């Protein structure tokens, strides 16, 4: 039975084999690939079609691997950003087994949007969806530190946690624009430098 997934991480084992961590629509899989170091289809961030052979008391063996390429796979700039996000997502999901199809479907949509959109903008939009799906999005701007309302200029920290600029160091964004971003799920309201700063917050960890 074929399955599809995104490779989130690989680790060399034995001479040329790989342990391959794969996000599917049902599960984060930890699988064993014979001679995986030789296989140009097996790289973090790649999407694959594959099958699994179950093994008693051991990892499933990764078989029947077909690389599902991206239209933009040759653009090293975009692939760098993609692999940064994938590594952040691996660390976020590292201890998870079963999970919602949300995560696989989110990555599928990112890959599509990567064709024509700015990769950092796509990741910023995607992270907003992760926060909302996990119930971690603070749409009310109450300061994490002093518990008071924050108005007009909002400081954001890791995981878009809100603060007064006088209460914590982070990056500042206009309230009206953050509200538009959170409502529309579209970071188009922010200019390029604001996107860069949201992306720096994402790189603190999901
Ligand atoms: Zn405060």
Numbering used by the authors: -1 to 204
Task: Provide text from the study.
In bacteria, the recombination mediator proteins RecO and RecR are required to load the RecA recombinase on ssDNA for homologous recombination. RecO is a key recombination mediator protein that has DNA- and RecR-binding capacities. RecO alone promotes DNA annealing, and it stimulates RecA loading on ssDNA when complexed with RecR. To structurally and functionally characterize RecO, we determined the crystal structure of RecO from Campylobacter jejuni (cjRecO) at a 1.8 Å resolution and biochemically assessed its capacity to interact with DNA and a metal ion. cjRecO folds into a curved rod-like structure that consists of an N-terminal domain (NTD), C-terminal domain (CTD), and Zn2+-binding domain (ZnD).
The crystal structure of cjRecO was determined by single-wavelength anomalous diffraction (SAD) phasing and refined to an Rfree value of 20.8% at a 1.8 Å resolution. The cjRecO structure contains all the residues of the cjRecO polypeptide chain (residues 1–204) and takes the shape of a curved rod consisting of five α-helices and eight β-strands. The curved rod-like structure can be divided into three parts: an N-terminal domain (NTD; residues 1–69), a C-terminal domain (CTD; residues 70–134 and 173–204), and a Zn2+-binding domain (ZnD; residues 135–172). The NTD is composed of five β-strands (β1–β5), which fold into a closed barrel defined as an oligonucleotide/oligosaccharide-binding (OB) fold. The hydrophobic interdomain residues combined with the internal residues of each domain form a continuous hydrophobic core that penetrates through the three domains. Despite the extremely low sequence identity, the cjRecO structure folds into a curved rod-like three-domain structure as observed for ecRecO and drRecO but with relatively high root-mean-square deviation (RMSD) values (2.7–3.0 Å for 173–185 Cα atoms). The Zn2+ ion is located at one end of the rod-like cjRecO structure in the coil-rich ZnD and coordinated by two cysteine residues (C141 and C144) from the α3-β6 loop and by one histidine residue (H162) and one cysteine residue (C165) from the β7-β8 loop. Thus, cjRecO uses the CxxC…HxxC motif to coordinate a Zn2+ ion in a pattern similar to the Zn2+-binding CxxC…CxxC motif of drRecO. In the cjRecO structure, the Zn2+ ion tethers the two extended loops of the coil-rich ZnD and thus seems to stabilize the hydrophobic core of cjRecO at one end of the rod-like cjRecO structure. In particular, in the cjRecO structure, the positive patch is limited to NTD and CTD and does not extend to ZnD (left).
